Amino acid sequence: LIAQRPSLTEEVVDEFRSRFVIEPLEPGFGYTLGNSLRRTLLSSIPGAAVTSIRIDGVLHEFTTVPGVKEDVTDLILNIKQLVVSSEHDEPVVMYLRKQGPGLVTAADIAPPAGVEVHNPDLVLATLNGKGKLEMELTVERGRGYVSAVQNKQVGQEIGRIPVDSIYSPVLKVTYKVEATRVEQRTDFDKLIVDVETKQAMRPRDAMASAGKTLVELFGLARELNI
Amino acid sequence: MLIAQRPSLTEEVVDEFRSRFVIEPLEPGFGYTLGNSLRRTLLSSIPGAAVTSIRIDGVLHEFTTVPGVKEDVTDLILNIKQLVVSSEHDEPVVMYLRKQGPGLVTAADIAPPAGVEVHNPDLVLATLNGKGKLEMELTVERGRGYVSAVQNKQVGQEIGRIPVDSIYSPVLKVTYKVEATRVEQRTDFDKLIVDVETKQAMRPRDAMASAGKTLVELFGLARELNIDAEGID
Amino acid sequence: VLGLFFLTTDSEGRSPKGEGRAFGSSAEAIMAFDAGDLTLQAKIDIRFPVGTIPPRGFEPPAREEGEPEWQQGDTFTLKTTLGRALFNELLPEDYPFVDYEVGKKQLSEIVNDLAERYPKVIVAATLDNLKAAGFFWATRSGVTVA
Amino acid sequence: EGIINPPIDELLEATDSKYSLVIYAAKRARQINAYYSQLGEGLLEYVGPLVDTHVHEKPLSIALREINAGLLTSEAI
Amino acid sequence: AGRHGNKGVISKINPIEDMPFLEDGTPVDIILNPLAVPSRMNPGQVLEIHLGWLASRGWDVSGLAEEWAQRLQVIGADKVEPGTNVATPVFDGAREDELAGLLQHTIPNRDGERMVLPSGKARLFDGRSGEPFPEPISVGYMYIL
Amino acid sequence: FLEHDDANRALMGANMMRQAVPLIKSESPLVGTGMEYRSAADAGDVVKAEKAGVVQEVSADYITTTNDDGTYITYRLAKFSRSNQGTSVNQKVIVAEGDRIIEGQVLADGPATENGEMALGKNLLVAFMPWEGHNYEDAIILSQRLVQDDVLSSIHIEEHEVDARDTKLGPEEITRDIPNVSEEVLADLDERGIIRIGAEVVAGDILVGKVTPKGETE
């Protein structure tokens, strides 16, 4: 019978993991709100990903670059885990050039202005004395997952190969409910949402974007009535 | 990034209180979020008013037989909890019902106080034979959702008062189903159909608008964290 | 069949919460189940609206009244679980209420009676409803192998 | 909005057999499809769709609709 | 297919948010019908799954002074890091008591809490509705071909 | 856990593990019998050392090792070659630049092996439950994480050939100048009428341009 407006409070446990608490929720209602937040966070959150690459001296993803121990398909697999952020709506070409023996990683890449890599420790490939790697990674912005078959647009460029891009930067979302300490037979429940994202952004921004999408759809369901 | 098609809620009405609501094609996977969140915020988050306790003259809590009425106390409790009441007082209020002699007692004979109104006057309540002796006092309390019968030591204070289940929510049942629709050669779009049945007091579309309202200021909590943009329209 | 059996089975070996309490309608029972104070298998006194056909065994009993009554076409209260109410919501309104554990063989006699006494489109719709709710309540039946 | 949209029990009670019904509807569908392919020849023996028709519809659905509506008859020679 | 004669075509590739997920937000990767196994009379896959889970999150057994614990200590399978491969020979596999006791003593993942009950089943949420499933659901790791 | 399975299901599983395709990258079973290393090494597709030495050079195409007696031995690896069933036999590398090598030690993996250990599939999170009827009659429901993370995917190589012969009317010619066809169809062909290496091709496209010399003309 009592009316209290719900409030959201964020606590942080790591750099990119945090728990959000919404205490005065109605009984039997924390689970569904947590699930709506989790489904909006895991799928529709904007981000950036590598959508196509081009290795010099390589025409398709089934060859081997002369001087690396990982074939081009393993290079596709290693690039697909590279988390990036691209301010530009248009695709941006990033450059990775390495000569001589060593260990080419994401810290060795050259990000243009507006595009930033976020896991420089990700190992990309290895190079022996006669190894030489030159890639021109095309990065784009989107949401969800887009396969390689939807990422091809140029036919005259034989050397360019599209990769399947994973755009969502959220690692895992969880929710939990309890019983509030206030004494009524209603027994209101608090909702704790544990959001852990990749290094692309803090979970606060991801929860903000999920809330924006959900409030827009529910305002669509609302304003068309009355 | 940009959403190609914008959804639009449409209402197909089937009765005075029953209705069905179709959402024009949503994004892949967004049918079920909207469906269950809308169903649970419809069935529980809408405020309403209902009865909470009743008091019958000359009876005991262990004495389930009521004098002068053919219906037992269970059917009487069921019929009272099936009655719709609207209140604006925001504290529990005692409302009376008195009848003498035989006949049929309905909700029309119920005399409501100021600020408390009864939307259903025609449903039957009980039968009387011979001497009536019908004097009941029932508590109307404004609430939100559904709470079962709870006791607060009112049986110790008086032996006639027994609690009754409360149906606060104007909506009676909400059933959602998410099916598939195809536009622009992409079959993985969700059409959400929400069939909502309410009581005759409150219009179903007004209840759905209130549910959407509560969801808007409920998911605005995540908005105050950061002003982040998303592909719209 | 596993889902329909779990929906319509008895409250033997499963902890019944909210067993033996009157309910105004099936919608209120569903709301109580969503609240969590009522389990699917719990003998409750549930009322049914006008047009609901009572069970075949309901005819020899009747409500005690000094006036003539006919519970064949109007409202009545029944002592049954919520799962049987949902299962009969799947079945057509003209079909009599079933008040027993369904399982497989009883489902066979129900489907045979439906095919014998009802048109083809009604039978197809009722088997579609039984299929959908069987899958739905087999998901929530908690069956697994450890 | 499908194959089953003509209810079949009505067709059986309007035909009293099942093979008669299927060959009956097949003959009517052939007549309707021949009418659609007349190319403006105006042949008298071919009678068009007696029930309302959309922009594109199979002649057999139209044939079953006319059989169900009861506005068409057949007799054995 | 698995290694125990279980097979099936794929009927739906669900989205990640639609899969039922565990207590830490970890979605399950494949959903199998439990109706098949008692009729096919090959419970061993279930056994595999439990040990698969035990090989995902490692175990710490030392000084437990139990029969299975002493067997694992003398064998050498008493301190196992998470993710390391385990070996059950085709007729000298891990016994029932060993699986049960190791499921009791699985190392915790986060918040100091272990996630699969000693019965071998875990409380599992719903990815569509969001309400948790009523009974605990048996989860683990099967090697699928 | 064979002793727990039925004999019929053991028969089916043993006869069905031979149909497992090799995936993009393979992982050895998280739980499985210890014979898998012996069952992968004894099969000869895994590159093993003939002599003991130290690795000198490592790459995707070859591994050059200097044995202790002084000789220099190079192992070539088959990368994206076609097996008899159409599956690839791509061989990954597990050895480092300068680690020691003994006789019979695995230098490079094979198809469907990891670290010299047999790997015919992937280990996935499993829950036993009926789920909305999509796992009915032992069907399979699975996450999209096995699509987006490249878990259950495989390279399939198909070979297809044609020959330009000398028939009675004349010699068949492999030529670019295909008659009765638009220019954009033959855009990706070489000067002699060969589709280029790495040219994405779809159904109905021209691979190699062969023309028959002539036919009875009426």
Swiss-Prot record, chain C:
Disulfide bonds: none
Domain of life: Bacteria
Self-association state and partner proteins as the record states: The RNAP catalytic core consists of 2 alpha, 1 beta, 1 beta' and 1 omega subunit. When a sigma factor is associated with the core the holoenzyme is formed, which can initiate transcription.
Protein family: Belongs to the RNA polymerase beta' chain family.
Described function: DNA-dependent RNA polymerase catalyzes the transcription of DNA into RNA using the four ribonucleoside triphosphates as substrates.
Stated name of the protein: DNA-directed RNA polymerase subunit beta'
Origin organism lineage: Bacteria, Bacillati, Actinomycetota, Actinomycetes, Kitasatosporales
Residues of the whole record sequence present: 582 to 727 of 1299
Curated annotation (Swiss-Prot), chain D:
Catalytic activity reported: RNA(n) + a ribonucleoside 5'-triphosphate = RNA(n+1) + diphosphate
UniProt-listed Gene3D superfamilies: 3.90.940.10
Molecular function (Gene Ontology), one example: bacterial-type RNA polymerase core enzyme binding
GO cellular component, one term: cytosolic DNA-directed RNA polymerase complex
Cystine connections: none
The enzyme's E.C. designation: 2.7.7.6
Keyword Transferase: yes
GO BP of this protein: DNA-templated transcription initiation
Domain of life: Bacteria
Record-stated family: Belongs to the RNA polymerase subunit omega family.
Physiological role: Promotes RNA polymerase assembly. Latches the N- and C-terminal regions of the beta' subunit thereby facilitating its interaction with the beta and alpha subunits.
Name of the protein in its database record: DNA-directed RNA polymerase subunit omega
UniProtKB/Swiss-Prot annotation, chain F:
Domain of life of the organism encoding this protein: Bacteria
Described function: DNA-dependent RNA polymerase catalyzes the transcription of DNA into RNA using the four ribonucleoside triphosphates as substrates.
Subunit structure: The RNAP catalytic core consists of 2 alpha, 1 beta, 1 beta' and 1 omega subunit. When a sigma factor is associated with the core the holoenzyme is formed, which can initiate transcription. The RNAP complex including the principal sigma factor HrdB also interacts with RNA-binding protein RbpA.
Protein family according to the UniProt entry: Belongs to the RNA polymerase beta chain family.
Protein name (Swiss-Prot/TrEMBL): DNA-directed RNA polymerase subunit beta
Species assigned in the record: Streptomyces coelicolor (strain ATCC BAA-471 / A3(2) / M145)
Range within the parent protein: 582 to 799 of 1161
